[PDB]
Nucleic acid binder design. Structure first.
Ligand SMILES: [Mg+2]
Ligand SMILES: [Mg+2]
Ligand SMILES: [Mg+2]
Ligand SMILES: [Mg+2]
Ligand SMILES: [Mg+2]
Ligand SMILES: [Mg+2]
Ligand SMILES: [Mg+2]
Ligand SMILES: [Mg+2]
Ligand SMILES: [Mg+2]
Ligand SMILES: [Mg+2]
Ligand SMILES: [Mg+2]
Ligand SMILES: [Mg+2]
Ligand SMILES: [Mg+2]
Ligand SMILES: [Mg+2]
Ligand SMILES: [Mg+2]
Ligand SMILES: [Mg+2]
Ligand SMILES: [Mg+2]
Ligand SMILES: [Mg+2]
Ligand SMILES: [Mg+2]
Ligand SMILES: [Mg+2]
Ligand SMILES: [Mg+2]
Ligand SMILES: [Mg+2]
Ligand SMILES: [Mg+2]
Ligand SMILES: [Mg+2]
Ligand SMILES: [Mg+2]
Ligand SMILES: [Mg+2]
Ligand SMILES: [Mg+2]
Ligand SMILES: [Mg+2]
Ligand SMILES: [Mg+2]
Ligand SMILES: [Mg+2]
Ligand SMILES: [Mg+2]
Ligand SMILES: [Mg+2]
Ligand SMILES: [Mg+2]
Ligand SMILES: [Mg+2]
Ligand SMILES: [Mg+2]
Ligand SMILES: [Mg+2]
Ligand SMILES: [Mg+2]
Ligand SMILES: [Mg+2]
Ligand SMILES: [Mg+2]
Ligand SMILES: [Mg+2]
Ligand SMILES: [Mg+2]
Ligand SMILES: [Mg+2]
Ligand SMILES: [Mg+2]
Ligand SMILES: [Mg+2]
Ligand SMILES: [Mg+2]
Ligand SMILES: [Mg+2]
Ligand SMILES: [Mg+2]
Ligand SMILES: [Mg+2]
Ligand SMILES: [Mg+2]
Ligand SMILES: [Mg+2]
Ligand SMILES: [Mg+2]
Ligand SMILES: [Mg+2]
Ligand SMILES: [Mg+2]
Ligand SMILES: [Mg+2]
Ligand SMILES: [Mg+2]
Ligand SMILES: [Mg+2]
Lengths: 159, 208, 171, 296, 23
RNA sequence: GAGGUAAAGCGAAUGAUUAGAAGUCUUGGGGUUGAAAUGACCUUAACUUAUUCUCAAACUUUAAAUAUGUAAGAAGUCCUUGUUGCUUAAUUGAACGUGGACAAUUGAAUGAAGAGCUUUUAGUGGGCCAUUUUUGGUAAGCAGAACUGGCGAUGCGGGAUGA
RNA sequence: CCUAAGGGGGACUCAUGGAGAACAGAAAUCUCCAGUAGAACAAAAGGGUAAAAGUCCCCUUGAUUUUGAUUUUCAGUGUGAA
RNA sequence: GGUUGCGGCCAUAUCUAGCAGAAAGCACCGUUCCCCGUUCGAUCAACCGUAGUUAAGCUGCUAAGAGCAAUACCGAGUAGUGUAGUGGGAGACCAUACGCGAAACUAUUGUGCUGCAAUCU
């Protein structure tokens, strides 16, 4: 007999963290979600209402609706050869703001601050990010660091 | 009754132990893992000799029992029953299955026997004895090697008996009062925890 | 200071138990005896499970017990110690500083005998404690009692011997 | 021979509760239900009337909760009452009523809703809720937070409730926990509630005890005796206190006999400070050597 | 009148462990 | 961000599991110390304590690799103040806006016979093989799954010969 | 299968161990301490739950009405369930 | 800086055993007419702040403490793994190449930080 229920295979996914069971810290209920916010989805096993399906555990999406205790999040799911827009109603216990927005949002501020400062100084500044480049030339001092010669060691048994 | 061991040599299946899910499992043929003078103190038998597997393989409980009996008999016959402490270091916890005891429909087998799954470098048998009984104990294990399939090496341990310390570090910890007897084994001093209990347990502790 | 006023030992409560093995009229008369002795309506205890050997069944009203505090507890305790002629054993004191004894006839206490009532034996247990036990019993900020403030066997034994001029045996 | 229970694995796998739950001070279930706000009202806060009783004081605070911690809006203490004319019985039910009225009036002064939402100016003990004014801002809405204290008809927390309701704040409530509620005949006897508002029970105890035990009256009611305050003029003590509370509900802090730095320096002289690593290492060496005398 | 209330939860007990004879 | 497989762990929970040592007033028994004591002794067996050997697809604190969700701007960021019957104690917010500022390094790489969209219809709906992961089975040129690449549908050079 | 074993609120805290109390003993009832859940939650198993979701008490019928939106299986059809 | 009320993070805060704690606070503490709840004013309810106490709570310090937390020329570039070969080996399995890379172990350090309001030698 095959089994394919709603929470099948979620034995460990929906578990609470070790030594983290019980009551929900109240910063979860004090956070404010606005339409357009990017949120990570992580089902809390101790709250069974407004709980996401196991597919959305670990997914990140956009808030589109705000209700009394829940937010609506838009997820794009692959169905065959295309994406289908999914609209999941989730209580805020299974939701947390995504930490990706802010890095962008700080880099936007830093670029704006750097551009005006170069504009203030009448010079130019380059704002595009760069991948790590190969390192330049360098000189290695040997005062106190004369090279030590190593050799491969013979085989030994230690039991 | 019992198939040839060649049918069960390799670790082809996941571990299938006794549990709440398989209950009608027979007992392993090997029940005794410590032989000889198992109550001897650590200082009596400094020399340790291992039989080590050079194979990722399964060894039946029948083979374990046979090799244990062979080694024990030979060593007690040649050097006496109180000249060694033999320990079998692998326990057969994996259940083999047999199907016929139609065809392939509903072919999930019944428990048939027990085997230990050994890796490369895993110790199968350990023998702590005196140095003068080396050639005897070695010859005791080399015969036991014949009861096993695959390749095994007889390796003389660098350590004192069944302890994790080398034969020089044990003497250092012994003259420093940093080890005490515990019957067949020993306890080592810890520099952590209740100071008073540690000091009481090791009166001969030359503190520095 | 070990000689502090608030470290004074004194009785917390006295619990009177009559475990009549059956339900019905006999248990009712034991409850009448307890309500007579204490002046308070007692409470009946139900069997937690069924034992055929003891002739009891689950949720059958078996025993009756009552808790008394204050001067009435002191009066009942000395009335019961008179029956024991002020001589307990060392084994009668628990490691937590509580003690108990058991009388065999309730007319020995000094109450009127009724043929309809009959005689019942009775069980006495005294819970000892110093001041400040409310910490462990209040709702908010419940905590534990410090080691020196705890009640133990020796302090209770010495306090009983001093306050009653009695003897604590140990046979 | 039983197994020792308190093993190292027991401590290793132990999950400690929230810090303020292990102190036994916060019921986080009730706190979650009180504080949590409708997510579609976003940053509009819920306001709590925190009511706490100590052995000597009544604390009433208007609080809104945030991630960095709770923030006090206003606060009225029972020890503020002597400024208003109540010097004794700072934990009466009537002292609770006075504290509730004071915190309500002080909050309304801070907001600016003084002339609007005066409240129940003629306290007759009738059940009443602060009704909104047409074509105007709604009354300041506050929900009661009694903490761990049990809900009983006659409890002192609902005295602060009635005071806050009478002070002009809108606090939703029912009258079946007030003193004077007949549970059999489900109506409120407003006469007994008004009696409780103006210290009627204490004055009646004074009168009933005085003619039955003068020595106990002398010990229990000392402060009244050296002030020559009888039962019949208790009511005036509250009626005036009420008036004064409505005249100037603003908070006046106690003038401090020392400055913050002087207080800190004085307190810093006591309380032992942790030993350096070297000191305890020397202690360990001494204890090892001093253990050598019991080698037998 | 009044009676003791079930503080426990062993609804389908009707017996108890550890209660072994010959012990 | 999510995950709970590999590995690892068991003097960490659960479950399995070898050996001694020291202890205890329910020790589980045998003998004698005994008038008997249940109060010692010799013993085995129980537990307790600190250790010891070995394990788990349906155990687990920890915890990969590979693989996976989202973001990397002009539909962006910031400033001011318009609309509502929603919301706030409110002149608070919510959403949608007027007006203004930030100009090509307009905010990573690489590529892009360009991107996007629609209608309509064929054949097919027996599959099989190789590496790796993997299940049943003693195994099978056996049966069954995962990912990819192939044969089928495909000739050419090699493997003599061979999907 | 359940008028509660549904809903709300309140109070309390289980499994088990130790030490004690007449009959009473391995198992009756009473007391204290310890007790991270080692219990209980209708029924398989997993997850979840401790001033509770467990035990007890009080009041109830939200197991109600009108229909939309959404999640799973999915053709993004039905049904069931949420 | 201490203390209280309300908190955020939720053990660097827990657990065990000792010792100390000025001021205020908190607390234990005293009583039962009243609202209220109990077998029991023990809990809960109310009254007094009057008769007493830091004994306990609470707070701080101590411990080659348990636990927890952090760090690393610790173990270990080990186990494992992505990718590769007409590599080795009868096989089981193993080596090498380009990459990623643990857990246990060992050692050291630390043992709540902090927001709003009020108050204090
Ligand atoms: Mg089946
Ligand atoms: Mg299945
Ligand atoms: Mg998880
Ligand atoms: Mg539901
Ligand atoms: Mg859902
Ligand atoms: Mg530029
Ligand atoms: Mg297989
Ligand atoms: Mg055999
Ligand atoms: Mg061989
Ligand atoms: Mg009977
Ligand atoms: Mg915690
Ligand atoms: Mg509540
Ligand atoms: Mg039950
Ligand atoms: Mg594994
Ligand atoms: Mg493994
Ligand atoms: Mg591990
Ligand atoms: Mg004998
Ligand atoms: Mg404006
Ligand atoms: Mg514009
Ligand atoms: Mg980049
Ligand atoms: Mg077509
Ligand atoms: Mg088509
Ligand atoms: Mg077609
Ligand atoms: Mg067709
Ligand atoms: Mg075919
Ligand atoms: Mg066909
Ligand atoms: Mg291929
Ligand atoms: Mg290959
Ligand atoms: Mg096939
Ligand atoms: Mg074809
Ligand atoms: Mg081709
Ligand atoms: Mg060709
Ligand atoms: Mg060819
Ligand atoms: Mg060929
Ligand atoms: Mg239910
Ligand atoms: Mg219900
Ligand atoms: Mg309910
Ligand atoms: Mg409840
Ligand atoms: Mg229905
Ligand atoms: Mg279907
Ligand atoms: Mg559907
Ligand atoms: Mg569909
Ligand atoms: Mg559908
Ligand atoms: Mg449907
Ligand atoms: Mg400082
Ligand atoms: Mg003081
Ligand atoms: Mg009282
Ligand atoms: Mg009270
Ligand atoms: Mg103190
Ligand atoms: Mg003190
Ligand atoms: Mg430590
Ligand atoms: Mg430490
Ligand atoms: Mg590899
Ligand atoms: Mg390959
Ligand atoms: Mg070649
Ligand atoms: Mg490599």
């Amino acid at each position: 007999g095959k089994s394919r229920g709603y929470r099948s295979g979620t034995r460990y996914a929906f578990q609470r963290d070790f030594k983290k069971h019980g009551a929900i810290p109240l910063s979860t209920y004090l956070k404010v979600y606005k339409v357009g916010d990017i949120v990570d989805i992580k089902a809390n096993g101790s709250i069974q209402k407004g709980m996401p399906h196991k597919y959305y555990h670990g997914k990140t999406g956009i808030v589109y609706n705000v209700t009394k205790s829940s937010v609506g999040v838009i997820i794009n799911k692959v169905v065959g050869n295309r994406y289908i827009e999914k609209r999941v109603n989730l209580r805020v216990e299974h939701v947390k703001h995504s930490a990706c927005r802010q890095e962008f949002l700080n880099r936007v501020k830093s670029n704006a601050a750097k551009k005006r400062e170069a504009k203030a100084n009448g010079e130019t500044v380059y704002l595009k990010r760069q991948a790590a480049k190969p390192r330049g030339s360098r000189i290695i001092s040997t005062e106190g660091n004369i090279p030590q010669t190593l050799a491969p060691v013979a085989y030994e048994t230690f039991i | 009754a019992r198939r040839p061991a060649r049918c069960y040599r390799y670790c082809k299946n996941k571990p299938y132990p006794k549990s709440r899910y398989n209950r009608a499992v027979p007992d392993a043929k090997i029940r005794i893992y410590d032989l000889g003078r198992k109550k001897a103190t650590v200082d009596e038998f400094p020399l340790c000799i291992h039989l080590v597997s050079n194979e990722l393989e399964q060894l039946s409980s029948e083979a374990l029992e046979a090799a244990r009996i062979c080694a024990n008999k030979y060593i007690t016959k040649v050097s006496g029953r109180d000249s060694f402490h033999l320990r079998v270091r692998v326990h057969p916890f994996h259940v083999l299955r047999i199907n016929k005891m139609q065809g392939m429909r509903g072919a999930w087998g019944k428990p048939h026997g027990l085997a230990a799954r050994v890796s490369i470098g895993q110790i199968i048998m350990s023998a702590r004895t005196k140095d003068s009984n080396k050639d005897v104990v070695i010859e005791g294990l080399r015969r036991a090697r014949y009861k096993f399939p695959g390749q095994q090496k007889i390796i003389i341990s660098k350590k004192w008996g069944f302890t994790p310390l080398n034969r020089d570090e044990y003497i250092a910890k012994k003259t420093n009062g940093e080890v005490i007897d515990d019957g067949a084994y020993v306890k080592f001093l810890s520099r952590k925890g209740n100071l008073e209990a540690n000091l009481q347990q090791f009166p001969n502790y030359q503190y520095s | 200071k070990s000689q502090n006023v608030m470290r004074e030992l004194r009785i917390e409560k006295l619990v009177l138990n009559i475990c009549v093995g059956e339900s019905g009229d006999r248990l009712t008369r034991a409850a009448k005896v307890l309500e007579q002795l204490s002046g308070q309506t007692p409470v009946q205890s139900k069997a937690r499970y069924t034992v055929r050997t003891f002739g009891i069944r689950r949720n059958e009203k078996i025993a009756v017990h009552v808790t008394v505090r204050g001067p009435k507890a002191e009066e009942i305790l000395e009335r019961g110690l008179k029956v024991k002629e002020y001589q307990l054993r060392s084994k009668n004191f628990s490691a937590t500083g509580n003690f108990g004894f058991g009388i065999d006839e309730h007319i020995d206490l000094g109450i009127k005998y009724d043929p309809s009532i009959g005689i019942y034996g009775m069980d006495f247990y005294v819970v000892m404690g110093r001041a400040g036990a409310r910490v462990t019993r209040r709702k908010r900020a419940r905590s534990t009692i410090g080691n020196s403030h705890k009640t133990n066997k020796e302090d209770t034994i010495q306090w009983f011997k001093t306050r009653y001029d009695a003897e604590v045996l140990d046979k | 021979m039983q197994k020792e229970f308190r093993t190292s694995a027991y401590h290793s796998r132990f999950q400690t509760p929230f810090r303020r739950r292990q102190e036994g001070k916060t019921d986080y279930y009730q706190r979650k239900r009180l504080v949590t706000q409708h997510k579609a009202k976003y940053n509009s806060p819920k306001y709590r009337l925190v009511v706490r009783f100590t052995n000597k004081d009544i604390i009433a605070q208007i609080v809104s909760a945030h991630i960095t911690g709770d923030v006090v809006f206003t606060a009225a203490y029972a020890h503020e009452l002597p400024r208003y004319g109540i010097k004794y019985g700072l934990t009466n039910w009537s002292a609770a009523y006075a504290v509730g009225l004071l915190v309500a009036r002080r909050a309304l002064q801070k907001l600016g809703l003084d002339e609007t939402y005066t409240g129940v100016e003629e306290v007759e003990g009738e059940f009443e809720l602060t009704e909104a004014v047409e074509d105007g801002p709604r009354p300041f809405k506050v929900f009661l937070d009694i903490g761990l204290q049990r809900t009983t008809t006659g409890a002192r927390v609902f005295g602060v409730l009635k005071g806050a309701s009478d002070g002009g704040l809108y606090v939703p409530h029912s009258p079946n926990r007030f003193p004077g509620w007949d549970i059999e005949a489900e109506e409120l006897d407003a006469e007994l509630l008004r009696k409780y508002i103006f210290g009627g029970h204490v004055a009646e105890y004074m009168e009933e005890l005085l003619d039955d035990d003068e020595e106990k009256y002398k010990s229990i009611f000392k402060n009244y005796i050296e002030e020559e305050i009888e039962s019949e003029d208790v009511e005036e003590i509250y009626a005036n206190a009420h008036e004064a509370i409505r005249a100037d509900p603003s908070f006046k802090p106690t003038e401090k006999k020392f400055t913050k730095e002087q207080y800190k320096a004085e307190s810093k002289k006591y309380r032992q400070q942790k030993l350096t690593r070297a000191e305890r290492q020397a202690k360990v060496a001494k204890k090892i050597a001093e253990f050598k005398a019991q080698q037998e | 009148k009044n009676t003791s209330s079930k503080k426990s939860d062993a609804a389908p007990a009707s017996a108890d462990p550890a209660k072994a004879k010959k012990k």
